[PDB]
Design a protein around this ligand. Sequence first.
Ligand SMILES: OC[C@H]1O[C@@](CO)(O[C@H]2O[C@H](CO)[C@@H](O)[C@H](O)[C@H]2O)[C@@H](O)[C@@H]1O
Ligand SMILES: OC[C@H]1O[C@@](CO)(O[C@H]2O[C@H](CO)[C@@H](O)[C@H](O)[C@H]2O)[C@@H](O)[C@@H]1O
Ligand SMILES: [Mg+2]
Length: 580
Amino acid sequence: KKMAFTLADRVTEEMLADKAALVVEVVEENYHDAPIVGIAVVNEHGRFFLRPETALADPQFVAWLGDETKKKSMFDSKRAAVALKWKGIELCGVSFDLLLAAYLLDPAQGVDDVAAAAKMKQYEAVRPDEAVYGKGAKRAVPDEPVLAEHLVRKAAAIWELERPFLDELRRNEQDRLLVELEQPLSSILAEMEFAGVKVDTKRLEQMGKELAEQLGTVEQRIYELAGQEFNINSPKQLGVILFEKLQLPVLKKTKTGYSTSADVLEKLAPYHEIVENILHYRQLGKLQSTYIEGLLKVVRPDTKKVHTIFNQALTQTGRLSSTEPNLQNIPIRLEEGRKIRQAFVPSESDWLIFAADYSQIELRVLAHIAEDDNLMEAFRRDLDIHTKTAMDIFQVSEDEVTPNMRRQAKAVNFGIVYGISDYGLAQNLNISRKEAAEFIERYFESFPGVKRYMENIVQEAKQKGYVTTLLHRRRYLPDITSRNFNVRSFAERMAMNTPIQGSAADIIKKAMIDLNARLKEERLQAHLLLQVHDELILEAPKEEMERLCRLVPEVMEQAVTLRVPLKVDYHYGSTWYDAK
DNA sequence: GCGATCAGCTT
DNA sequence: CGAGCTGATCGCA
Ligand SMILES: OC[C@H]1O[C@@](CO)(O[C@H]2O[C@H](CO)[C@@H](O)[C@H](O)[C@H]2O)[C@@H](O)[C@@H]1O
Ligand SMILES: OC[C@H]1O[C@@](CO)(O[C@H]2O[C@H](CO)[C@@H](O)[C@H](O)[C@H]2O)[C@@H](O)[C@@H]1O
Ligand SMILES: [Mg+2]
């Protein structure tokens, strides 16, 4: 059973061949400034294991790592690249990434280790990472003989699996998606994460002190109105106070008790004064715990920066996710929460934050793919799409569109993009399922191309077994044939939504690639910091703002050519908050 | 400690 | 109605 390999004491020339499977192991989930516990190399000459303190101090090995002509095949090269960036070492020549390859082939597999990717091609001569390292409090790096064999086995699988993975990607017309989009993007994300975002901790600490004062006042007011002290953050104890002691109506229930959601509490406000205070307490408590305290926990004390990790291989649509901290959900909607963004500042003196976002990219992608004449014309005239939808579905002129009509047409537009269902829209607009169905019916009469696409896409998902995006990303939908109404409906909604949300993901990913290429051609010091689904956040010297005002929107607008134009809005300021 | 449940923040 | 991550509580060991 055991796999042969050389547990080397020093680096030799045969370990530096021009094609190899490479493993640079970082066990810690958060790889920023984290240890590299071991190194494995597999090539035409054999299998090798190197101790990191030895290999990373060897000039010939470091040079090999940074030589772009020396091709490497890896799994999660971004993790390795960043851990190496923290050590001052540049990783180049990664021509194949098994994690990204597995992800494009089928994102539903949830491949998060070499073993899971390998199982897709009936290769099982490698253990899962969790089996070797354990989990949670028991998580630990094993002794050298166990560690070394695991790393060599991982590199061996990568070496073996490259050909079959590339062959299937080619068959799926996804070879260019891997090589020209996801892999170059991986390198860009690595730079962004390493750069980090500077945080004004003193601003945060002062906001935290003001919130603590306001929480105390509201908290005591809640105990006064209830005539009793209890744990407000406990939906169980709160439910007793509201629905039993104060006798408030039960409009909705959960699986384990009474519902205390914001929308539920919103309806209970007129009955008792305690309701508005609990809502206010929930608002302040969310900012304090998640955005003040939670953010302060992950700020590096030396540099005052946050280094998020973008998961490029998780979502089923092709979007990225962000963790430790999640910087894709910083408050913006309410002013009190929006002020959290004042804490995100440029990393250098006399630099500014520049933010640029696509305007209605999802609805524009839908106009393109459905080839709906009305929707295409709307965007060609650059109309306010929600006002336009209201005019159409409610049969009125522009002057006759009221604020409530626009708000409801806006909801119909979101529903259409998310995969339309009468029950979901109804819940969202607080109306009946029958009334919501009336809006949908009206929409499809005004936008017959969109109705045709929605019908056709569901049919295609059933015929092929999957749906695809503009740049050939795919999502398998086996539940599209289920005889369970709920399970089948969800797959139908995903069939409708994925090519829209997914193609928008394709476009911004390409824009980021195109942008970095332009920033480098123009020798600008400007660099990407964050991506929030339809927007790009950068920082640059103040002297570069005027060039960016022209460069950034143009690159983002020209990323792809659709049947309708792409439109990008932009702003800049002293903090992320001011870039509005 | 572990994770199920509920709640809330974003696009 | 689509796609995510994280904090507090509570029942569990
Ligand atoms: O390095 C990110 C990359 O690693 C995976 C596992 O293959 O996720 C790991 O890292 C994440 C960020 O630290 C953690 O949230 C997660 O718990 C951990 O398994 C991939 O999913 C991801 O692409
Ligand atoms: O001060 C701690 C003590 O207060 C209680 C209620 O008297 O809970 C309150 O304080 C907690 C921590 O700040 C909050 O999570 C909670 O929402 C609030 O009601 C007790 O539960 C706690 O022992
Ligand atoms: Mg936008």
